[PDB]
Amino acid sequence: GAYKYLEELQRKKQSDVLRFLQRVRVWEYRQKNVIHRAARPTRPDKARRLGYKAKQGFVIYRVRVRRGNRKRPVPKGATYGKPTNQGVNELKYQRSLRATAEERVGRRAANLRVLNSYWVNQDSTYKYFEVILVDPQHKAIRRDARYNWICDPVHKHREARGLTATGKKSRGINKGHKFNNTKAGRRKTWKRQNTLSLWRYRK
Amino acid sequence: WRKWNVKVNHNEKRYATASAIAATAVASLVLARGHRVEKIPEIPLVVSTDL
Amino acid sequence: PSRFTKTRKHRGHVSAGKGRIGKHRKHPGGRGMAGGQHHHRINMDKYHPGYFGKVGMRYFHKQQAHFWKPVLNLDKLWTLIPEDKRDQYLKSASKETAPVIDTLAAGYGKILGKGRIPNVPVIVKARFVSKLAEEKIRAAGGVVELIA
Amino acid sequence: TVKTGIAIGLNKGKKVTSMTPAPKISYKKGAASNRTKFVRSLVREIAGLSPYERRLIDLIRNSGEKRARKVAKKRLGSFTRAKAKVEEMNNIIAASRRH
Amino acid sequence: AISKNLPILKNHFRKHWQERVKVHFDQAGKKVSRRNARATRAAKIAPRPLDLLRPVVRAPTVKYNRKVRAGRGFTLAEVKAAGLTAAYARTIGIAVDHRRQNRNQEIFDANVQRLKEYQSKIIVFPRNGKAPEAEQVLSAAATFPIAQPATDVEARAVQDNGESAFRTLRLARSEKKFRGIREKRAREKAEAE
RNA sequence: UUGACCUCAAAUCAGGUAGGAGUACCCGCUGAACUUAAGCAUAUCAAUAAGCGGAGGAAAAGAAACCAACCGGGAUUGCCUUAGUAACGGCGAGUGAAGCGGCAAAAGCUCAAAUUUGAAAUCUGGUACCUUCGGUGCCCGAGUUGUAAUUUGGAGAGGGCA
RNA sequence: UCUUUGUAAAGUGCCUUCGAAGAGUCGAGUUGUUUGGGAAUGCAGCUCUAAGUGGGUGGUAAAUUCCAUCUAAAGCUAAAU
RNA sequence: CGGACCAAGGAGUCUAACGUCUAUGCGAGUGUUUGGGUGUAAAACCCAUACGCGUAAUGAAAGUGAACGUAGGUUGGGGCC
RNA sequence: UGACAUUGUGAAGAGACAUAGUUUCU
Ligand SMILES: [Mg+2]
Ligand SMILES: [Mg+2]
Ligand SMILES: [Mg+2]
Ligand SMILES: [Mg+2]
Ligand SMILES: [Mg+2]
Ligand SMILES: [Mg+2]
Ligand SMILES: [Mg+2]
Ligand SMILES: [Mg+2]
Ligand SMILES: [Mg+2]
Ligand SMILES: [Mg+2]
Ligand SMILES: [Mg+2]
Ligand SMILES: [Mg+2]
Ligand SMILES: [Mg+2]
Ligand SMILES: [Mg+2]
Ligand SMILES: [Mg+2]
Ligand SMILES: [Mg+2]
Ligand SMILES: [Mg+2]
Ligand SMILES: [Mg+2]
Ligand SMILES: [Mg+2]
Ligand SMILES: [Mg+2]
Ligand SMILES: [Mg+2]
Ligand SMILES: [Mg+2]
Ligand SMILES: [Mg+2]
Ligand SMILES: [Mg+2]
Ligand SMILES: [Mg+2]
Ligand SMILES: [Mg+2]
Ligand SMILES: [Mg+2]
Ligand SMILES: [Mg+2]
Ligand SMILES: [Mg+2]
Ligand SMILES: [Mg+2]
Ligand SMILES: [Mg+2]
Ligand SMILES: [Mg+2]
Ligand SMILES: [Mg+2]
Ligand SMILES: [Mg+2]
Ligand SMILES: [Mg+2]
Ligand SMILES: [Mg+2]
Ligand SMILES: [Mg+2]
Ligand SMILES: [Mg+2]
Ligand SMILES: [Mg+2]
Ligand SMILES: [Mg+2]
Ligand SMILES: [Mg+2]
Ligand SMILES: [Mg+2]
Ligand SMILES: [Mg+2]
Ligand SMILES: [Mg+2]
Ligand SMILES: [Mg+2]
Ligand SMILES: [Mg+2]
Ligand SMILES: [Mg+2]
Ligand SMILES: [Mg+2]
Ligand SMILES: [Mg+2]
Ligand SMILES: [Mg+2]
Ligand SMILES: [Mg+2]
Ligand SMILES: [Mg+2]
Ligand SMILES: [Mg+2]
Ligand SMILES: [Mg+2]
Ligand SMILES: [Mg+2]
Ligand SMILES: [Mg+2]
Ligand SMILES: [Mg+2]
Ligand SMILES: [Mg+2]
Ligand SMILES: [Mg+2]
Ligand SMILES: [Mg+2]
Ligand SMILES: [Mg+2]
Ligand SMILES: [Mg+2]
Ligand SMILES: [Mg+2]
Ligand SMILES: [Mg+2]
Ligand SMILES: [Mg+2]
Ligand SMILES: [Mg+2]
Ligand SMILES: [Mg+2]
Ligand SMILES: [Mg+2]
Ligand SMILES: [Mg+2]
Ligand SMILES: [Mg+2]
Ligand SMILES: [Mg+2]
Ligand SMILES: [Mg+2]
Ligand SMILES: [Mg+2]
Ligand SMILES: [Mg+2]
Ligand SMILES: [Mg+2]
Ligand SMILES: [Mg+2]
Ligand SMILES: [Mg+2]
Ligand SMILES: [Mg+2]
Ligand SMILES: [Mg+2]
Ligand SMILES: [Mg+2]
Ligand SMILES: [Mg+2]
Ligand SMILES: [Mg+2]
Ligand SMILES: [Mg+2]
Ligand SMILES: [Mg+2]
Ligand SMILES: [Mg+2]
Ligand SMILES: [Mg+2]
Ligand SMILES: [Mg+2]
Ligand SMILES: [Mg+2]
Ligand SMILES: [Mg+2]
Ligand SMILES: [Mg+2]
Ligand SMILES: [Mg+2]
Ligand SMILES: [Mg+2]
Ligand SMILES: [Mg+2]
């Protein structure tokens, strides 16, 4: 199947063929609007492993988000407060640029629901993404048992609670001693260990 | 989150109820407790199982 | 309860048990363990020598259990045999048939040797013995057997 | 293996009568396969060598597999991958502009 | 605030801790709702028995391998060894575990013998309709308890072939302590030209 | 000259959806200082308050790129405990989890990557009939730049044999 | 109780061949934040950027030789809370 | 310094974790109350597995681990003979 | 202010395997 080839040719980003491509494509995006409907997956192997399917009710979107750090707003870098908190410039922001991409298109079509998203390109100003979505009211989705979980109400804006792939990452949810602190969910596991369970027959 | 309940050693509990069980003999203390019983057959008053 | 509480006794005396001079203010010494090295150093050398600074190796990620090893002496040992079966074995202190105590079954890790068990043979399944522990068992006809 | 039967020492452990259980295929994850072998190779003559690699083999021909590795270890992430990376350019060279 | 001869206490109350006190007033309440909700399961569960069959398993670490303990499920082996497939044995109240592995035969033979006795003491009503009403036994873990394996005899002969056990320990500890060095001396001695 | 195809537009075009509220609990972003240290900056208060986004009846987590080092264990979650411990710390003030063990509840799985290639086997919509949370015929349309079946690592697939 | 949905669909034994498994990701440098995690617990930014007997973990940095232990970079899911 | 006068409010608490002491239970062990059982239902009644503290110490650790002896000798010791 | 990334295409000149051109800079 032609898909395995695509998967591997994509893993050769310094390869000549790919950067001729990636330099011609990455201009063609910076001309269109920061958010614009894609027409098809430009990485159909990638989409289709990330959950995508070519049938009415699946959507792809290209979104562009500036790179670098979060400059702490704060008028004139003025902090009012202690030295540890006196920084403005070398702070990073806890969610990835994936997330921010997802979140802005998900708001752009609230009637869609963000399935997943993948990285596609980048210059020094922007990182580019294609965000694969699912209209949960399209009946071709609504039947089709496999996807229709997405239709539920608990999967509303799954991408602004970090339940897309990239948000489960930055949320730190993974098993094991590497993730103790953030794993059942950080504030939850926090708040647990900071509760004073008193029994009736006090132990 | 004041205390409200109280732990009693399980055994001290029995020791208590045991002593309370034995006092329900000694005529004097049942009369002491109220209990109009100078007109009862004997103590422990035991009654047919058909009750 | 509150009726034997001294503060009931104190009702009607200006100061509440707390001196007119020195009052009951907020935190005279500082709060908590403040001035440990300073205005409270007399109380921490004596009552708490050894408090300050370091000793020994760290031990990142130390799972207690690795070091699980309850200790029972010859001192008892015989107690790991129910009393009824017990005298059956004291009397008739022989090879051929001598009791087989599985102390790791009984929940110990080492047999130590606190002192004197009778001249009855015992078979001791243990994980670890002390020298004397094993020595004293033999001089009554027992052996240790090494187990896991 | 075979445990000794005591609680310290080399093969410390309770003697049990053992069994060696049916191997798992969540254990042959890395294993090549003729389909991947094919496809990755057809890719390679398709797409070529990459800047940091085109520097790596000429480095080999003119400095060998020590300054090669040392360069590859920084370029990639790690000594280990740097090893198996030199190795991959060694074997570019051989079967190519040679035999 | 340091005074008197007093153990140095460590009371962590410097967060808004009154904001996270959990007083289990609903203890008795919850027992009630738990019992009640079992009883509803037990009824919705038809003549089935609330629980699944668990395997015997020797527990991990140097602290608990003495004991043997009900595990999770039954290994693809024991299931097949006791002659029924996985996918079915889970409809017959038997729990499988595709992760657990069979290294120890004694526990293996055990768990098949566990599988045997379970199948023998249960009856599977047919898919037809009949439903020959047959009164739930409620556990299964009670039906099929888990025993600690007997490892010997109350008394036996005193075999003293002489080697101090104590000493056998240090000697084995040591063999392990210099195993690495003693092998470096074997490499540098083999290197003798 | 006439018909596509790609990509992009327009309709008061056909049907649908999002907004706001609430917010005890829940997924996140963001983020103090009062305070404590008997001073004070690291620390602490607190990954707390205020600010912003997002859900449900619970949320989230979840069938191991886990725990381990055992005779090994076996998704998640919560409690008892581990433990005021290991560890962090002007190693000062102060901070501080986890593995095992018992218990509550249990339940498990599906895509991607495979030629259906002797037949796109699949699907939205329109429409006529019906036994209307839907079914059937016909037609536009989607879809091969891949819709179905099969397969998901515990496996499993193509041959052959019983 | 009415339709037999079927020349349908699934389970099991042996022989043989095969066994496809996620990439600006894993990983590395660094910066900042965070954590009990201490030559660096998680998180993000920027540069570098893998492999297929590979990869990740193994709570002291490194080179070598082994062993154990899972299978990442797509997904769903009741209860106890 | 406060206090014109009256009434009525009005200040050493509760909790977590502790020291000495005392009472009670049981005693080399002890703690039923996470939980299950059960009930005339937030009560009482019952209970299996663990756990906690205690029954071993000492070293930074690797580790080792408590009878020469009527569990010693001496000197005071109540009480008893 | 420097390095890297954004960043490509020529031509002359220096610069190494040590006076073939893959590479690097004026
Ligand atoms: Mg590559
Ligand atoms: Mg379309
Ligand atoms: Mg300020
Ligand atoms: Mg501020
Ligand atoms: Mg740019
Ligand atoms: Mg923490
Ligand atoms: Mg959180
Ligand atoms: Mg949370
Ligand atoms: Mg209670
Ligand atoms: Mg109390
Ligand atoms: Mg009172
Ligand atoms: Mg009074
Ligand atoms: Mg009081
Ligand atoms: Mg007084
Ligand atoms: Mg008075
Ligand atoms: Mg006083
Ligand atoms: Mg005074
Ligand atoms: Mg005064
Ligand atoms: Mg005075
Ligand atoms: Mg002082
Ligand atoms: Mg200290
Ligand atoms: Mg150290
Ligand atoms: Mg150490
Ligand atoms: Mg020790
Ligand atoms: Mg003793
Ligand atoms: Mg000794
Ligand atoms: Mg004093
Ligand atoms: Mg606390
Ligand atoms: Mg405070
Ligand atoms: Mg409540
Ligand atoms: Mg309740
Ligand atoms: Mg149950
Ligand atoms: Mg075992
Ligand atoms: Mg264990
Ligand atoms: Mg029926
Ligand atoms: Mg309209
Ligand atoms: Mg809203
Ligand atoms: Mg909110
Ligand atoms: Mg903050
Ligand atoms: Mg305050
Ligand atoms: Mg201060
Ligand atoms: Mg002050
Ligand atoms: Mg100040
Ligand atoms: Mg500070
Ligand atoms: Mg902090
Ligand atoms: Mg708080
Ligand atoms: Mg808030
Ligand atoms: Mg609602
Ligand atoms: Mg629901
Ligand atoms: Mg519920
Ligand atoms: Mg899996
Ligand atoms: Mg294992
Ligand atoms: Mg688990
Ligand atoms: Mg500590
Ligand atoms: Mg402080
Ligand atoms: Mg503090
Ligand atoms: Mg301290
Ligand atoms: Mg903290
Ligand atoms: Mg804490
Ligand atoms: Mg358990
Ligand atoms: Mg299911
Ligand atoms: Mg099949
Ligand atoms: Mg398929
Ligand atoms: Mg994978
Ligand atoms: Mg750098
Ligand atoms: Mg922050
Ligand atoms: Mg380190
Ligand atoms: Mg860090
Ligand atoms: Mg290493
Ligand atoms: Mg490995
Ligand atoms: Mg899916
Ligand atoms: Mg989920
Ligand atoms: Mg004055
Ligand atoms: Mg006045
Ligand atoms: Mg008054
Ligand atoms: Mg007052
Ligand atoms: Mg007192
Ligand atoms: Mg007493
Ligand atoms: Mg005891
Ligand atoms: Mg009770
Ligand atoms: Mg009730
Ligand atoms: Mg009863
Ligand atoms: Mg039990
Ligand atoms: Mg105990
Ligand atoms: Mg002690
Ligand atoms: Mg000692
Ligand atoms: Mg020393
Ligand atoms: Mg030694
Ligand atoms: Mg001597
Ligand atoms: Mg001597
Ligand atoms: Mg003398
Ligand atoms: Mg410059
Ligand atoms: Mg160009």
Return the SS3 of B28.
helix
Contact list, C65 vs chain E (CB under 8 Å): 61-63
Q: Is B3 on the interface with A (CB under 8 A)?
A: yes
**How close is the Cα of E170 to the center of ligand 88, in Å?**
8
Task: Quote the DSSP letter at residue A160.
Answer: G
Q: Which of A158, A105, A111, A162 is nearest to A128 (CA)?
A: A105
E175 touches chain D (CB under 8 A): yes
Choose among C33, C40, C100: nearest Cβ to E152: C100
What percent helix, strand, coil does chain C show, rounded to 5? 20, 15, 65
Under 8 Å between Cβ of C134 and E163: no
Resolution (A): 3.3
Q: At C25, is the secondary structure helix, strand, or coil? A: coil
Give the whole-angstrom CA distance, residue A192 versus residue A144: 39
Count contacts between C and D (CB, < 8 Å).
Answer: 18
* DSSP-derived secondary structure letter, E148: P
CA distance E123 to E100: 27
Contact A176, A170 (CB under 8 A): no
Dist. CA C13–CA C15, nearest whole Å: 6
**In chain A, whose CA is at the least distance from the CA of E26?**
A200
**Are residues A202 and B1, on separate chains, in Cβ contact within 8 Å?**
no
Residue with tokens 């056990």: E165
Q: Is the dihedral of CA E99, E105, E107, E113 positive or negative?
A: positive
| Nucleotide closest to residue A22 (CA–C1') | G24
CA atoms within 13 A on the CB side of C106: 21
Neighbours, chain B (3 or more CB pairs < 8 A): A
User: Distance between CA E29 and CA E8 in Å, rounded?
Assistant: 39
B21 close to B43: Cβ distance less than 8 angstroms: no
Long-range contacts of C132-136 (CB under 8 A, 24+ apart): C133/C73, C133/C74, C133/E166, C134/E164, C134/E165, C134/E166, C136/C74
Structural element, H or E, at residue A162: none
Judge contact between A46 and A19, C-beta under 8 A. Answer: no
| Secondary structure of residue E108 in the 3-state scheme | helix
Is D35 an interface residue toward A (CB < 8 Å)?
yes
Pick from E75, E2, E16: nearest CA to C27: E2
**CA A147 – CA A137 distance, rounded (Å):** 12
Q: Which chains touch C (3 or more CB pairs under 8 A)?
A: D, E
Q: Contact D19/E101 with Cβ under 8 angstroms? A: no
The span from the CA of C119 to the CA of C94, in Å, is: 10
> Does any CB of chain B come closer than 8 Å to the CB of residue A203?
no
Query: What tokens were used for C125?
Result: 């399944």
Per the CB < 8 A criterion, the answer to whether E97 and E73 are in contact is yes
Residues of chain A in contact with residue D43, where contact means CB-CB under 8 angstroms, are 5, 8-9, 12
E73, with CB counted inside 10 A (0-12, 13-18, 19+), is buried
| Chain A residue with minimum CA distance to E15 | A194
Q: How far does residue C24's CA lie from ligand 17's centre (Å)?
A: 11
| Chain D: touching chains (3 or more CB pairs < 8 Å) | A, C, E
Burial of E124 (0-12, 13-18, 19+ CB in 10 A): exposed
Report residue E101 as tokens: 């592995």
Torsion of the alpha carbons at E145, E151, E153 and E156, rounded to the nearest 10: 180
Q: Which of D9, D17, D22 sits opposite E106 (nearest CB)?
A: D17
C128 contacts D5? CB cut-off 8 A: no
> How many Cα neighbours within 13 Å face the side chain of C8?
5
Is the bond leading into B44 cis (omega within 30 degrees of zero)? yes
Nearest CA in chain A to D35: A4
The verdict on a CB contact (< 8 Å) between E77 and D21 is yes
Pick among E13, E16, E24 to test the A interface (most A CBs inside 10 A): E24
CA dist E163 and D32 (Å) reads: 54
Euclidean distance between CA atoms E147 and C58, whole angstroms: 41
Distance E57 CA to ligand 62 centre (A): 33
Question: D39 is written with which tokens?
Answer: 């496809």
**E121 contacts E97 by C-beta, under 8 angstroms:** no
Residue B3, CA distances (Å) to A198, C5, C11, D66 in order:
9, 17, 26, 73
* CA dist list (Å): E24 to A39, A196, B8, E170, E173: 57, 11, 19, 53, 51
Q: By the 8 A CB rule, do E45 and E67 touch?
A: no
> For residue C99, which of C75, C81, C76, C112 has the smallest C-alpha distance?
C81
Site from A196, A200, A203 to mutate, B interface, most B CB atoms within 10 angstroms: A200
Q: Any chain D CB within 8 A of the CB of A8?
A: yes
Interface test with A, best of E13, E22, E99 (most A CBs within 10 A): E22
Determination technique for this entry: X-ray
Beta-carbon contacts of residue D71 (< 8 Å; ≥ 6 apart)? D55, D56, D59, D82
Cβ separation of E172 and D9 shorter than 8 Å?
A: yes
Which uninterrupted H or E stretch holds A119? strand A113-122
The strand ranges marked E within C9-97 are: 71-73
Answer for A67: CB within 7 Å of strand I.
no
Which token pair is C97? 């048939």
CA of C69 to the centre of ligand 83 (A): 26
Q: Which nucleotide is nearest to C53 (CA to C1')?
A: F91
- The dihedral through the CA atoms of D77, D83, D84, D87 has a sign that is positive
Residue A36 to residue A46: CA distance in whole angstroms: 19
Residue D24, chain A, CB below 8 Å: the answer is: no
Cβ atoms C93, C121 nearer than 8 A? yes
> To 5 degrees, how large is the angle CA A15–CA A21–CA A22?
85
- Protein-proximal nucleotides of chain I (any atom < 7 Å from a CB): 5-8, 16-18, 22-23
Which residue lies nearest F56, CA-to-C1' measured? A154
Residue D97, token pair as written in the block: 């502009």
In terms of phi and psi (left: phi > 0; alpha: psi -120 to 50; beta: otherwise), the region of C115 is left
Strands C98-102 and A196-198: unpaired
Which one of E63, E105, E151, E167 would you mutate to disrupt binding with D, by most D Cβ within 10 Å of its Cβ? E105
Would the CB atoms of B7 and A202 count as touching at under 8 Å?
yes
Please answer yes or no on whether D39 and A4 come within 8 Å at the CB atom. Answer: yes
At residue C56, the 3 state secondary structure works out as coil
Q: What is the largest CA-CA distance in chain D?
A: 61
Interface contact flag, A200 B7, Cβ < 8 Å: no
Cα torsion A203, B5, B8, B10: sign: negative
Q: How far is the CA of D54 from the C1' of F11 (A)?
A: 57
Per CB-CB distance under 8 Å, the chain C contacts of D12 are 148
Contacts of D18 in chain E (CB under 8 A): 103-105
